[PDB]
Every structure is written in structure tokens, then in C-alpha cells.
Design a protein around this nucleic acid. Structure first.
Ligand SMILES: [Cl-]
Ligand SMILES: [Zn+2]
Ligand SMILES: [Zn+2]
Ligand SMILES: [Zn+2]
Length: 120
DNA sequence: TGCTTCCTGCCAATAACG
DNA sequence: CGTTATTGGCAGGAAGCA
């Protein structure tokens, strides 16, 4: 159908037929495969752009609304995504957000309707 | 070479099923 | 509506880009 399997050292991999990318998760292969098939379409609700993954569309739509969900706990500045937040904390505070301390807060998404993670 | 978007393991939230 | 399947949000490194 849309994949074959490699089994190496007991570990199972799922291989896309088209580009031969390997996936540990079958769910990942399927998510990825839409890029080839365009079976599903994820159109920005604010403009003409269309995405092959739902999450790509959501991250894009956040740019339309201007919501700043990522907040630096050291100085309070907020950022639209992880990358700007991380870049700020490393350059300005000389600390790594992926270290063993919580240096930022991810606020819930309020400018769009997306599913809510209870831990935020 | 510093923004910008992509990528995929993981799994909570949601949907589908029966 | 309780059990199973699916969706897609998240991190944070990778890749794209000018
Ligand atoms: Cl905001
Ligand atoms: Zn592929
Ligand atoms: Zn748009
Ligand atoms: Zn700060």
C-alpha cells in the first residue's frame, strides 16, 4: 500500500515507498505520507495557503493572529514560537530552555480554537 | 548566518466505533 | 457510552532560505 517494513536488530522501521524515509511510528509514516498524496488538505482560514499537515497550518495561523504564547520567565518578554523564545533566553540570559529547569511558560492558545492541553 | 519553516517520537485529546 | 482508533500539539534539532 503506502509503506514497507525494515527490521534491524529486532527494531521495526516503516519505510515510505515514495521517498524511502524511515519511521519508528506507523502514525508518523501516515502523517508524513499526505505530503505525497495530498489526500487531505489543510487550508489557512485567513489566506490562500494550504498545508499537508494540520500542525503546519496551525503554526501558520498563529502568525495571522499575532498571539505570543511563549513567555520568558526571567524577564517577562513573550514570543510567537519556541525558536524565538529559545534564541532570546540563550542570547540574553545565557541559559538553555531545554536544560533541567523551566525557563519559559507556554500559555494556552486563546487566539484560535485548537485542542487544549490541561497542563498549560 | 540568523531568521523561518520543517520534521517526527511521543502521547493527550478527540473521534469513531459498535 | 465504554472501548478502540485517530488526530495533531509539543519540543527542539534539522533543513531551507536569502
Ligand atoms: Cl498574546
Ligand atoms: Zn515519503
Ligand atoms: Zn494564512
Ligand atoms: Zn527574558
Amino acid at each position: 500500500d503506502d509503506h514497507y517494513e525494515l527490521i534491524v536488530d529486532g527494531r521495526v522501521y516503516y519505510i515510505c515507498i515514495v521517498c524511502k524515509r524511515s519511521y519508528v511510528c506507523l502514525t508518523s509514516l501516515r502523517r508524513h505520507f499526505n505530503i505525497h498524496s495530498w489526500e487531505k488538505k489543510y487550508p489557512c482560514r485567513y489566506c490562500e495557503k494550504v498545508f499537508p499537515l494540520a500542525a503546519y497550518r496551525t503554526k501558520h495561523e498563529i502568525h495571522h493572529t499575532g498571539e505570543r504564547r511563549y513567555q520568558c520567565l526571567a524577564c517577562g518578554k513573550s514570543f510567537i514560537n519556541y525558536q524565538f523564545m529559545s534564541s532570546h533566553i540563550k542570547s540574553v540570559h545565557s541559559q538553555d530552555p531545554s536544560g533541567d529547569s523551566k525557563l519559559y511558560r507556554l500559555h494556552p492558545c486563546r487566539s484560535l480554537q485548537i485542542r487544549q492541553y490541561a497542563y498549560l
